[PDB]
Design a protein around this ligand. Structure first.
Ligand SMILES: CCOc1cc2c(-c3ccc(C)c(S(N)(=O)=O)c3)n[nH]c2cc1-c1cnn(C)c1
Length: 259
């Protein structure tokens, strides 16, 4: 029913998220303002994971200044036993919203695209490459996608797919900013064609076969927005060296040409 963080009290109104030993609550302060609060129980945590949490917090904090396309962290508490993160509250994670909506509006989809670019651009500018990027990581907050996590700390599932893994991450076992470009591509592909590139492929053992396979070609059906079709093509190129960059993407006409 009730969470104390650095003096203040919040009433738990609902659980929204539930990773390993972490839980996210939709809560309310005394003035009845909403906030998401992340509780991470630490009793079991070993130094690797403990450092991962400390790392996420520090970056999440640092990055506050640079962009509003990053989840806002209002304040936090941390002891040897727990973590509480008081954060901004949104409407829905993107993943759970790409199921709900039938097919997206052009103007919104572009807006969401800009939003993600700015977000991922920011983490890159601070030497972070979020390797496991996916729509579950973004969060709608009054017409804005904001980034929830950095792939530094262990992932939470909102109350795990391989649709977004980039080639070079699969071909890896015997990293690049470009990895995130692929994953963002996949999210945008979804937002134009109602599905990811390989989400019709059934078996996962072989889902990661199509991805790596140069001979396997990806289907880009024509659409009224010719720019968008190019972005998709440029993002989903299998060779990191020849895949478009975030800074290139930010100057692409899809983001830049008006209407
Ligand atoms: C596992 C999901 O993580 C988060 C979810 C949220 C939300 C949120 C997400 C989904 C829903 C459906 C809602 S809702 N409409 O308020 O119930 C809020 N707001 N702020 C949030 C902040 C987080 C979060 C978790 N870690 N970090 C760093 C941010």
């Amino acid at each position: 029913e009730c969470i104390s963080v650095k003096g203040r009290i919040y009433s738990i109104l609902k659980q929204i998220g539930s990773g390993g030993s972490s839980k996210v609550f939709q809560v309310l302060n005394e003035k009845k303002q909403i906030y998401a609060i992340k509780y991470v129980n630490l009793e079991e945590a070993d130094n690797q994971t403990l450092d991962s949490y400390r790392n996420e917090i520090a970056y999440l904090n640092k990055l506050q200044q640079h962009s509003d396309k990053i989840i806002r962290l209002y304040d936090y508490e941390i002891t040897d036993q727990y973590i509480y993160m008081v954060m901004e509250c949104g409407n829905i994670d993107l993943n759970s919203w790409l199921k709900k909506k039938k097919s997206i509006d052009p103007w919104e989809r572009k807006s969401y695209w800009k939003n993600m670019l700015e977000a991922v651009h920011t983490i890159h500018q601070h030497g972070i490459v979020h390797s496991d990027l996916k729509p579950a990581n973004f969060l709608i907050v009054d017409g804005m996608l904001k980034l929830i996590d950095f792939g530094i700390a262990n992932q939470m599932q909102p109350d795990g797919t391989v649709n977004y893994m980039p080639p070079e991450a699969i071909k890896d076992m015997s990293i690049s900013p470009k990895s995130d470009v692929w994953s963002l591509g996949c999210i945008l592909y979804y937002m134009t064609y109602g599905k990811t590139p390989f989400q019709q492929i059934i078996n996962q053992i072989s889902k990661l076969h199509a991805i790596i396979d140069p001979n396997h070609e990806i289907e880009f059906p024509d659409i009224p927005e010719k720019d968008l079709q190019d972005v998709l093509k440029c993002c989903l190129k299998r060779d990191p060296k020849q895949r478009i960059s975030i800074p290139e993407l930010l100057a692409h006409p899809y983001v830049q040409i008006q209407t």
